[PDB]
Amino acid sequence: MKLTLWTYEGPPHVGAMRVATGMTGMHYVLHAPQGDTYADLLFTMIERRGKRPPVSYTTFQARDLGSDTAELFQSACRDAYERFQPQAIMVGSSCTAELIQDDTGGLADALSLPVPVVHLELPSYQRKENFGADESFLQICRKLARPMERTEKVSCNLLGPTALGFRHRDDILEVTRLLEGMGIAVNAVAPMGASPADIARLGAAHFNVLLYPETGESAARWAEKTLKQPYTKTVPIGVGATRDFVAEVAALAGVAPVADDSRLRQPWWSASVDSTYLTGKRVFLFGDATHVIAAARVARDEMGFEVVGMGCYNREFARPMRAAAKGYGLEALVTDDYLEVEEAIQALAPELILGTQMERHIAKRLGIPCAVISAPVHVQDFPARYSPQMGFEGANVLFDTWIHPLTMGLEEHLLTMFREDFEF
């Protein structure tokens, strides 16, 4: 009923689509109305993924509102198998077919396709895309990932990276570099580059690594029991989080905590006399829960920013969010509308607000320095340049991206100061 203008999160089937588009060769066929293929635009433009996302909406119309929708789905699955030959295939429904129940899993079993089929139950009215992605990942792990022999080398699986994710593609590369640096080999990244063969091999690792808890906590928790696999908690955004993560995977694997920090310039580039106006600036962090928490641990501990606000939109992650908010002395804004956060920063007026694209836009509307750290973004925020957000190079990226608004502000402030004085 609530009047929504900018939903931070899409519907959950978008999340399932993100997981499917991320990995290779698993066709997430959908029972969706004609027109719901709009989601393909996100992956084809903002992520600029070349090939069409491996998803086949049934696209039913006023002609199709009865058992004809079931026949549409039947066709969609058998077609998708032959035409778009997968090794694994998803089923599910959007809002419309969620209301017009069609027994998606029953239909998929009715085809009885030789490739595994992952039945997806996606409540599309009370949950959101982060759920959708996590639930889809969990279902495909329980359908394809079975316990098996540990790799003789100590190995880990990165879980969490997901197509159309904030710098996920770069972050996998950075964390892979770091893990290999310690000595840990990455067994299979899922679900951003994995393949159903790789999901089958998931169990072979010694311990999963949670890069993005939003899309990976369910998978890691299930892996803890089914595959007897511990998973690291500290997402390594920023220098301090990187050190903790290094120590954590070191303990988990058994290898020394040596990690090469010769690319760490942020501790030096922020301790410099140049970065002294940055001390005690007010910041309003908003967006993804893990991103916000780690960004706060950076802002208040490695940059000198004073956190004056904090907020989130992952209700799923409200508990750690609130815990951290107490940690910094603030109160977490676990909301899902731009109105609340807008009023919050207007009351607070922090110097550097940062977060979702909305934070940037209503920063501009309020003329406040603006940065981007969280998930909801457009094509510009998806860069072609190597810009991870975790690891040491992630720390440097955070530094530059955060103080760029500040440098712009200082330079424009000067330029207005200069060439301008009382006329007489």
Binding site: M1, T7, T37, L72, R83, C95, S124, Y125, Q126
Partner: protein, 400 residues
């Protein structure tokens, strides 16, 4: 005609994106689920960040398992929004796929809201769901919603039934008054002040090709349709102006004098953009239904050989005027599933591959120079002065 397949077109709500630009005193409350909310959020893009009149009230689980509660709550939220937005004078409830399936009485809801709101806010309802509509058709439905309400005028008036930008509609009006009398009344009223007097003798000038049902709704009032090829090039524009002129009565001399400057204005521009289009294969996929007009223009003026002009919704009584200038060579096939025309594109490799945005990037990676028709509705290229700009837009001869 999707062969039970993936029809890539959007649900009609994406038309609201530019409709809200046209009628600047009109709010659009969409009752779609989070899927439709995400669609508006995305397809609008930067619209969201400047207080757009895009209420996407999401119907949550509480709105499920109940019908009267749902539309009562809708009444409540509407009242709240006019409390936050007193400037609005026409509220546009729109039917969504979730609204259709739950059988929400959008008409009755709009009726009760109008009743308790009065003439100060003339809330209207229409349908823009993907279960019924397809992209542009939403604009058709939205204007058809106001069609019965518009004042009945039996006097001979002209209706500018189209949402062209000011730098387009104003030019059209200026030209029409330059040769004809021009009792032009733009149906997509800029404000409620300019309420057009639709009527029996108020023959309506159709200017946006995708408008199909519009025809029916206006003709119910008696408003006749001019069989004028659609104003989209040296042929469509000239024929449209000519037919509109003789429909109201204009001498050939006056027409020539009025259109002489535009004629030379656009001939040079179209030629200067056509050499990037000189003698190549085209392929229109069914995104938005402008393709027949685009083929009528581009194939004959810029020498773009017409392979297949796909169309999601073909029309006979409206498309006929520009259909006459259409060559028989292009395949008039309707909007199939993406696989069909995609395989056709792969087989008969076209130089320019106009399609939906979803296929634009893949076929671009698949060795097909692509132009997305999505740009067309926003970019003001629907009259004489912008005929060359349209050709330049279609050109896109990007080299590496």
């Amino acid at each position: 005609l999707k062969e039970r397949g993936q029809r890539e077109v959007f649900c009609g709500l994406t038309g609201i994106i530019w409709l809200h630009r046209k009628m600047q005193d009109a709010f659009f409350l969409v009752v779609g689920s989070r899927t439709c909310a995400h669609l508006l959020q995305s397809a609008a893009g930067v619209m969201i960040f400047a207080e757009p009149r895009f209420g996407t009230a999401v119907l949550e689980e509480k709105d499920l398992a109940g019908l009267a509660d749902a539309n009562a709550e809708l009444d409540r939220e509407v009242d709240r929004l006019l409390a936050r937005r007193p400037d609005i004078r026409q509220l546009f409830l729109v039917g969504s796929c979730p609204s259709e399936v739950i059988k929400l009485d959008l008409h009755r809801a709009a009726e009760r809201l109008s009743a308790h709101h009065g003439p100060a806010v003339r809330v209207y309802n229409f349908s823009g769901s993907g279960i019924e509509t397809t992209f542009t058709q939403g604009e058709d439905a939205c204007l058809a919603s106001i069609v019965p309400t518009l004042p009945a005028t039996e006097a001979r008036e002209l209706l500018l039934v189209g949402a062209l930008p000011d730098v387009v509609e104003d030019q059209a009006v200026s030209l029409l008054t330059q040769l004809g009398i021009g009792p032009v009344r733009c149906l997509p009223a800029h404000h409620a002040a300019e309420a057009p007097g639709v009527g029996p003798n108020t023959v309506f000038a159709l200017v946006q090709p995708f408008l199909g049902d519009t025809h029916g709704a206006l003709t119910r009032r008696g408003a006749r349709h001019i069989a004028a090829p659609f104003p989209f090039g040296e042929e469509g524009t000239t024929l449209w102006l000519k037919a509109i002129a003789d429909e109201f009565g204009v001498s050939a001399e006056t027409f020539e004098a009025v259109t002489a400057a535009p004629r030379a204005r656009a001939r040079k521009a179209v030629a200067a953009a056509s050499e990037g289009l000189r003698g190549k294969s085209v392929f229109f996929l069914p995104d938005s239904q402008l393709e027949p007009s685009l083929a009528r223009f581009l194939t004959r003026e810029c020498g773009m050989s017409a392979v297949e002009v796909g169309t999601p919704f073909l029309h006979r009584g409206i498309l006929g005027p520009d259909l006459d200038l259409l060559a028989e060579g292009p395949v008039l096939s309707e909007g199939q599933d993406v696989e069909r025309q995609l395989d056709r594109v792969r087989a008969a490799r076209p130089d320019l591959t106009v399609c939906g945005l979803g296929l634009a990037n893949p076929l671009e990676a698949e060795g097909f120079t692509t132009k997305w028709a999505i740009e067309l509705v926003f970019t003001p290229v629907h009259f004489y002065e912008q005929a060359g700009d349209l050709a330049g837009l279609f050109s896109r001869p990007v080299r590496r």
